[PDB]
């Protein structure tokens, strides 16, 4: 629900001129709002629920054969008839069995026979269709108060402060109002329907676990498959087999459980458990934050006069910022903490930014703890917790320098652009534009060109892009980009994203 | 895996019904044909590399015949 | 690695009866290759049922049973006099290869009393020094029986010799002998000797008893 | 069939560990090197069709690389 | 070639591409096998639960 | 007449007792003692940690 | 102050109930049952045989 020790956690820099944002979250992402005004907000999904879920079809993987029966008959006959043909539960076939004198028949050289063999599925895989109003989504929200290592990765604890929240969005109820207590109210308003495409692909039930698969590569399988009511099926000859024929001995033989098979058919399926509500790890959502009764209050609190103390020791969260946890020995609150980002320590002047805006203590009790997030600038710092003779500090170092940085929106900014398709400008928040206009450039250019050879499968299209690149060798001036077009990027790129 | 790499073909003695005979014939060609109907856009430049190098004609068509057949499971 | 275990151990069914044995695997998936073995005490078996559909040359086709995997079963609806053997069982796949707890045909008939007879020692044997007091229990059926040395009142477990036969041929009862070993001056300073046979057939033991003083 | 035309990829979002990925680098390579191991001879003569035609040396190279790749599991 | 055995059923199969299987094999004794791993798969890691 | 066995190959499996010992960063390997017997398949691996 | 323990290294070590499993040519892989302790070190081998 919050951010806390996220294994992807991503900030958003607040330029004000607006309390509503467009924002796109994830499951395992976590999405950190700082503006002014606004303290520090935590935006991610817990995962995506789906209500009721609809039968397709299903799958016979697994066969077994039964009661084989062949019915000889001489030269000459035409076709053979068994009597098996008549109920649909007896898998039946044409065939000839070689005929001398000595077996069967007064001729030479051909003959007719029917083999019949009563269908027997041993196992089969179930396949589900999503419905668009039967999605869910619970997306953990939080707003960063003065919290300890307990409360902060507690969800209760902190709706006893209003700081956290949960709720569910649906196509019937995209728009939910919750309130955050002594900081205000927030207005999310989400787009549940077309957050993922619920038409696109199914959920296929493989033994006792279901996964995801595309909805026209489900009908494709080739597969004893069956209706979704009760009895007759389609291709179950597939998984069975025939032999030669000798007099009237003809061995029907079934193929072993598929259901390797059908985890090898399984490559970039998800993983997805459920109970009583189906459980999505990877979200995707388009959802608005209103931030216009978000507030800030207590700026009537002062600084606090009394000593300080680390109930633990600071370090990296890993995604550019420190945190550190407080325990405050003195009686004075509550009172707004002292504490500080600065260069050096003979220059007062704050340069880090708290990532946890108005460090506050909850009540008077002493040695009260208190978990403050900021991020330090580049290079060496000092973390100064206090003013006067009361301050204990730390040093900090992070190599992160912008130069790095500016890769580092820039790359995962094109890995931002890939994988969420026309979506991946919503990262253009409050926009218009640029920002509209960049969408709607890849918009149609989503809607066709790679959408139009999509499908391709990791070399597939990154070997013939290198052979691509051959075309933007042999070329006339300003015919040059021409064949150089989709070349570069958009092709090599996500090829170079996945690896591996 | 046991999903590539199959027995066949033994192509010792064997003149029998094997265990899969008649869809050995279906194994790569509809695959592949359902790989390049999965994928017409490339189909489309795809063939386009055969005409670009070499002038030769016939030859030129060796190119695409043969390269649309390697994109399919590579 | 593979457990096996054939029940029941013994089964009194009259012949004709159809007899379906109870049986398992426990390394399971053994597909089938499960077999059927019949054993009379003191000879080789004879295997029944091979591919677990299919029998061997000398075996009449009265031997059936199907099965895969775990469990696995021998049936056979006219059972037979000729039938009357020690039921064995063995596995195949994985190794070591390993047979499961036997179980018994018993041809049913109705349940007979033993014929109990106590024997004092003989005078030749006295003059050895030992004295061995036998007691013959004769076409009992079934084997559930239960010899007491009761010498004077009081049991002796302590030189019990009990040596019984299996189901016999002709009347297909059990036949049981039990020998209670003394030396002479022991058995002279014991007076009444008696073994008494508890059997599902009377309530009661039959007491069978003489004492030296006695003849 | 279920062998061959897996899910993979389905590169829709998904920033996960999916149901088979570090074994998706296995799939194509192994199983031709295993092929062109298991056919050695074919290896000698494949690259020597590459020589043969067109004396323009770099993409003579092309022709065999991408070949080499044709014949396993055609 | 070998003579494979597929659940009841056995096979040929050739000896070189017998060995060259991908699949967990077994020696013929009793216990340790090879390449078991690949029957089996995993997952993330959240806390201890995998 | 008399055929050798060369070896076996199990096709299918099933997971038993599944066991993970979790431990912190900083911490190099992570060592269960189901390590010990070969009937238990353990592989190493990581928990992100908060 | 204070020191982790990353891991350890074994230098010096010393071969202790050296045992081979003899097996005829054909037979494919040698299995000891000393496979199952990782205690054991185990290899695998050949005899060439008359």
Known sequence: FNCLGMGNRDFIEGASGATWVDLVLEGDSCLTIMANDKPTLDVRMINIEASQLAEVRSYCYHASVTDISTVARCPMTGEAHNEKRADSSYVCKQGFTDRGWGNGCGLFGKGSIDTCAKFSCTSKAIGRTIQPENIKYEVGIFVHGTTTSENHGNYSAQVGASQAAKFTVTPNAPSITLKLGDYGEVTLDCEPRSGLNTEAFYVMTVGSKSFLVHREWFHDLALPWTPPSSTAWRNRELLMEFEEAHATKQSVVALGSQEGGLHQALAGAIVVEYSSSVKLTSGHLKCRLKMDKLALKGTTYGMCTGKFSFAKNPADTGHGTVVIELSYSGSDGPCKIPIVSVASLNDMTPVGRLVTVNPFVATSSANSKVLVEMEPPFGDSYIVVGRGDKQINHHWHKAGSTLGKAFLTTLKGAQRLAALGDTAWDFGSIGGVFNSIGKAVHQVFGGAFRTLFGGMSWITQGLMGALLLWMGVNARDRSIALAFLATGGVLLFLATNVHA | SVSVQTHGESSLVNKTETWLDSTKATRYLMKTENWIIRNPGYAFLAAVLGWMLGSNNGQRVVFTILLLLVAPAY | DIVLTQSPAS??????????????????????????????????????????????????????????????????????????????????????????????????????????????????????????????????????????????????????????????????????????????????????????????????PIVKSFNRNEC
């Open chain 3, 11 to 204: 089964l009194a069914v009259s012949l004709g009866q159809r007899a379906t044995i109870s049986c398992r695997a426990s390394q399971s998936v053994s597909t089938s290759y499960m077999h059927w073995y019949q054993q009379k005490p003191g000879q080789p078996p004879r295997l029944l049922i091979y591919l677990v559909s299919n029998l061997e040359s000398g075996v009449p086709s009265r031997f059936s049973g199907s099965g895969s995997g775990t469990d696995f079963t021998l049936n056979i609806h006219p059972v037979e006099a000729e039938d009357e053997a020690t039921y064995y069982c063995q596995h195949i796949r994985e190794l070591t290869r390993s047979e499961a707890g036997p179980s018994w045909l018993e041809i049913k008939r109705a349940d007979a009393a033993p014929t109990v007879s106590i024997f004092p020692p003989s005078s030749e044997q006295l003059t050895s020094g030992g004295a061995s007091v036998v007691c013959f229990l004769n076409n009992f059926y079934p084997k559930d029986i239960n010899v007491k040395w009761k010498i004077d009142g009081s049991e002796r477990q302590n030189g019990v010799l009990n040596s019984w036969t299996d189901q016999d041929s002709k009347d297909s009862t059990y036949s049981m002998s039990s020998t209670l070993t003394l030396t002479k001056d022991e058995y002279e300073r014991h007076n009444s000797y008696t073994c008494e046979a508890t059997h599902k057939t009377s309530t009661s």
